[PDB]
Design a protein around this ligand. Sequence first.
Ligand SMILES: Cn1cc2cc(Nc3nc(=O)n(-c4cccnc4)c(=O)n3Cc3cc(F)c(F)cc3F)c(Cl)cc2n1
Ligand SMILES: Cn1cc2cc(Nc3nc(=O)n(-c4cccnc4)c(=O)n3Cc3cc(F)c(F)cc3F)c(Cl)cc2n1
Lengths: 302, 302
Amino acid sequence: SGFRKMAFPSGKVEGCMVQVTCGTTTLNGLWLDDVVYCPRHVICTSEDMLNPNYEDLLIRKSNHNFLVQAGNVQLRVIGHSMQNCVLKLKVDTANPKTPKYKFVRIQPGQTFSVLACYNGSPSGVYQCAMRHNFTIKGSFLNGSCGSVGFNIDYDCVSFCYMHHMELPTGVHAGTDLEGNFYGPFVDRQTAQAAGTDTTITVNVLAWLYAAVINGDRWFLNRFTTTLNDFNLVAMKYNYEPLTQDHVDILGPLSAQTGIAVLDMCASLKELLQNGMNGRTILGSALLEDEFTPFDVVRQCSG
Amino acid sequence: SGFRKMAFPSGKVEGCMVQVTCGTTTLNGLWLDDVVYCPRHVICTSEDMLNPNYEDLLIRKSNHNFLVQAGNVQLRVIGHSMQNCVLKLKVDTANPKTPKYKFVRIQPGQTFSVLACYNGSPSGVYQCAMRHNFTIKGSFLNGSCGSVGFNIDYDCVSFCYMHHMELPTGVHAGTDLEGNFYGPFVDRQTAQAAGTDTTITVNVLAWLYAAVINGDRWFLNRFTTTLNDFNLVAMKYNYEPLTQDHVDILGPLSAQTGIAVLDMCASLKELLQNGMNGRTILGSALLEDEFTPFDVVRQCSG
Ligand SMILES: Cn1cc2cc(Nc3nc(=O)n(-c4cccnc4)c(=O)n3Cc3cc(F)c(F)cc3F)c(Cl)cc2n1
Ligand SMILES: Cn1cc2cc(Nc3nc(=O)n(-c4cccnc4)c(=O)n3Cc3cc(F)c(F)cc3F)c(Cl)cc2n1
């Protein structure tokens, strides 16, 4: 047992990470087959980062303006293209370490692992969720642009996030791997504000189930609730409404624990109206919402 | 910015993970050069797991009793040896993916990344600390025996933990890679109890500094404290006494933030005596003690 913020093993992504430089601007790229993917922002200079026109910027570049570094080996760029907010640099060598992969866009509330890199060098791995305002509460410093988020399904890396920038509040914004931003943000060095966030209710319930699986039961109660009355209470606390699809998704955990979803919702209602009274759940003093039902099942069942 | 539970990239360890079977007992091993390291408990049968004599058990085995599986390739065992609680299986192939590595034993309060594996297959990576009672609060299911904990220094993997077992309270016990247990535990399927734990004070202070670096300042105050008066208050709350060496270690964070260590100790004293009054620090409602000063510097500075 035990319950931890768990990321996917990162090796398959580490073997894809490279450094991309254009002019004096540098960041991280993702080398898959004979293409390197990176934020198009790399073709900006300090003069252009505020209000760039990327079509003009790219038309003014050629292959030789792009330096791609894989370890100590320079990959020669033999083509360049823009796809929305990502640059695609065709190189003359296919990555021998290319894993089986796919580009998948994720939904608010789902989770993924982030491999933070600097200068093409992986430095750390952590787990995060896509918030309902399409930001992620990541951990990123200057130089982390182009770091990727991903999930692993069996042997297949599903890339879902490429990091672009930090917002004023310190949360992070990026795109899927087709270069389409998550949320209403643009790759311009302008002060952009994240919208309002909500608590991912289904995830909180999944985490309460994880706690029960690990012997934390003090928050349980004899009461049950209707879905509608739960939602009436939960909206007041900035929680996402719970739907029947969410109940269905929680079916497996409900079965493994013998606690019906609406019964656990009654526990959640009480915790929202009363607080925790100085107690904890799975070592936390607040309700955790960055674990999906799938993450819980993976960690607690296998 | 941002502050997350961050593990080291795991690829270098993933390429070392193998499956070891003896009889019907199976678990994970660590293949480095031409040696596979695993818990000696693998030579136990269900009859022997309660009160084994491992010297007898190993004398009754030969190389052909050990099946080592690296992916789909079977490695032939050509020698076998015991070193304390780890078995060393000499195989006829050196691991081509062997990273530069070392075996280092860690101290209570220090942190490391865990690569949870099952049947030799890496499944997840998370970060944990060695508690003062020499347990770790890990996340492990049946089949995780032999999973390793490690740190990375530049290009060198410092292995520091091999997982053996789960204690009744759900916390975990294991050895260093020379087979020497952390804490007063033995590799016998007997009900063993973890001793009392304490909060890792220096780590809490390091995390308060991380919070200040990320703009969480509400807990700061004008007061300073002496080291002795802080310790008098902190012992009452089950915190480790703070030493001058701990102050020294916190020097860099103190400098980067301009807040003297004893000033932050005054904040910590107040949080201990008053609680958080419904506020949070770096997204947590309780004081976090699994980040060392080094982890904070690595994440917040680079
Ligand atoms: C020589 N040199 C200077 C460079 C500056 C760069 N800008 C950034 N670097 C970053 O690390 N963070 C960043 C910082 C912290 C966490 N997370 C990301 C940026 O936000 N920006 C700003 C930013 C990035 C975008 F991709 C975008 F569309 C709009 C922006 F305002 C980069 Cl990308 C390369 C540099 N090379
Ligand atoms: C066919 N088959 C059955 C096996 C049973 C095995 N026993 C365990 N497996 C484990 O996964 N956990 C475990 C479980 C959860 C978290 N963390 C570790 C054990 O604690 N034990 C118990 C245990 C392990 C030790 F290494 C030890 F010294 C003393 C113990 F009581 C293993 Cl090792 C292989 C098996 N093969």
